[PDB]
């Protein structure tokens, strides 16, 4: 329908930057600095009215066109300049491309009776400057109008006409021709020939293409004859620009952000043409374009004043949702003049078809004060926030174009440059300064360090500011022209030290928003302490500026400037400053998170604390839970409320189970006191789940102690009641190691795990080698396959021992113990063979319990446990077991996965309310099944299960975890009705007998933990399920990981697709949700 802005960000005209934070890495580069007193080829020979830039990119070079008069708008003479650049930073001198033109003596207008042209030069005015033809030729164009006096309008449709000339590869120009005559002008009374007279056929064709292109005729309407047939839309909407939407329609913009749409390539336009809703814009043009990443951007003055120059982003070219700074400085206007107004203005970029700059970035031309010509480079994809702290070595960059993480403001007479290890700021400009800004992650506690050298100590100024997102500086450091390094404390200053020229000082600044103070160190010694002179919530920028900010102009400054500033073309004596080795860091609890912040998720803990009573308090009360979460949890978001809420709930729930004991932390299963528990209410049944879930907690002390408590907490030895439940704990301890990388913890636990393994091996094997367990001792009383006081070979304990054996073999190799590797690897091969040969039921095609004589002939959830440890072979015959996931007669039920196949005649025949494992949904089991299903989907060539199937079962697990309208994790539930089968009984509340977030992290998001330095992800989310999601703040192998997905690029503004970050630096990328492997990125 129409271009519009729905962002809530407004620009405040009382500040020159609008209080807008800039996008990352914007370089503002001055191209032309007007100087009447010292005219030179490089400044257009002293002309001080310079305005209306045009931009193209052709044959590896930028072409920058602008117009100029000696001092006053519409006061002749008037001409058009051209400049070129390979890189956008270093430009050739302005070259006159269309020169002053004689208005014929005797010219008149109806609006000026009695006047005639005599010895009068025309006024130039163009809204379009460039066309690249189909044959790859570059045409530049301009137009001549007539101003009979100061007040006359050259764009009245009574002008002379429009001219063109070819720009050639070699830098030369072809001859000037007229392409359009205003009424009354023709070949016989104009001073350049008509374009059709050229003997260059291909040039003539190139010009003819301009005339046949309605998008170009739309940009001739202001100067062309009124009502001229060749103009598609005849109303004088101003400074037309357009771009192509993703569906191929064309969206237009004009001054005041008037906007329309064309469905026929620009021949006709939708009425009524109205201002783009929500856009703040006035008279100084708005530029819109498609970017190289497929998204869209507008650049404009978001204001009734011509400042700042800002950028708004859109994923689709219609809805714009952001507002940030491009250019926020205002050079003072040095030379007065007719219609010159203050600030950066008249933005204009490259038309579609007129070239794509090789760096992929967004380049926009504009003037400042209609006096100085500028360009800005904006990196694409356009990033709002910094995802990592600074740690910058400038010697690694050959030129400023490589300072992707620095915002740079570089006037011709105050340029920014590199000099080996140094970022250098120079300043000889009495009216401007050099300025660099390092945007960093918004921080409450901040350290900033850098090396600093000044080329002098008796002149110049350097201000160093620490800024929030609204340009509030909380503190300022200054190198003064009387040789003092000082800090601003309020109205007064702290003089910290005298500084000398040519000396390198190591500066460290420590800022705390909560304590509201800054401490400054030089060469390791504290030299300054002060309160912030302005309070801020967080600090996001460090700014280095070779001057004081000017308050002029304000919203109260008069519009017109008739004076020149004193010494308008003079110089200041040169001041230089150099910085190197810029580092920032934060001790904020969530500083390790690159995109997500805990403050946006703390509402979950708060809601959970308020929604119901706290029945039982262990080591971490509800009152401490949010703080604990902020320290310990990876952060997650997605667009589906229930998944996100469950993520946070299950962490909040798990945390209740951390218990203080005289031997350190323990982890409970039931919060209520159980009569069969070991010391400190410990129950061994779900330890494997406890470790798999808890391995993601960032502070290792909890899980270190929980494990040591089980194995050493009973007079230095293992808890006695570990013998009451089957164990996959050696597998779980290796799984922990694969997340945290802590070799010494794992190596030190090896003997304890061997002792555990050997006990089970001694007590629980049949003569044939298979393990037996009573179903009660798997924690699964009243199963169909069964075994209260039976010695059946269940695929529970056999797979677990397979897993423990395999894990202990691997721990042997990591120990350097090759004997142990073989001893346990042999046990693993032995058990794998026994499970495959003896527990695979060939009638059912399913792993099942082996009773004394024959199979139990019941498909149970326990039959999927072999895949929890990747036990089975890749052969096709085992696949078919997984079909029962999608069969209502198998495991598929309305609330998720049953513990026994629904077709079985003994399904749920042993009563209710007393913990029965003959069919009801048990999260303990669902978690096993889902872990196994993920392994199967990741590690096996497999055609039975899609992502939709896995996602759907995770969704049902989510939906099942509610009770009385609130998140709830209990013991077990009805597969058809969803009823949690202990009802409102206290015992079930916050049950810790399963995983959830381990499944979210390793299956759904798909982080696959490994022993090596390679990162492997493979999300099992279908294509088009979620437009975005992110898992952040993950502590994996001593590094902080982020995994994110952003289909349209607008959730995180770091590009489209699937991305992995390591400590906030991108490590890999894919266009789709699919397997992504980053080799040796750790
Ligand atoms: Ca152009
Ligand atoms: Ca200066
Ligand atoms: Na702001």
Automatic annotation (TrEMBL):
Please list the residue ranges annotated as the Glycoside hydrolase family 65 C-terminal domain: 1011-1066
Q: Which domain of life is it from?
A: Bacteria
Ranges for domain Sialidase come to: 256-355
The identity of this protein, by name, is: Exo-alpha-sialidase
Enumerate the spans annotated as Mannosylglycerate hydrolase MGH1-like glycoside hydrolase domain. Answer: 679-994
Any single Pfam family the record assigns to this protein: Glyco_hydro_65C
Name all BT-1020-like structural beta-sandwich domain ranges.
Answer: 406-561
Q: What is its EC number?
A: 3.2.1.18
Keywords, alphabetical: Glycosidase, Hydrolase, Signal
Q: Give every BT-1020-like N-terminal beta-propeller domain span.
A: 1-237
Q: Does the keyword Hydrolase apply?
A: yes
Give this protein's Gene Ontology molecular function annotations. exo-alpha-sialidase activity
InterPro entries registered for this protein in UniProt: 6-hairpin_glycosidase_sf, 6hp_glycosidase-like_sf, Beta-prop_BT_1020, BT_1020-like_b-sandwich_1, Glyco_hydro_65_C, MGH1-like_GH, Sialidase, Sialidase_sf
GO process annotations (BP):
carbohydrate metabolic process
Extract the Gene3D superfamilies matched here: 1.50.10.10
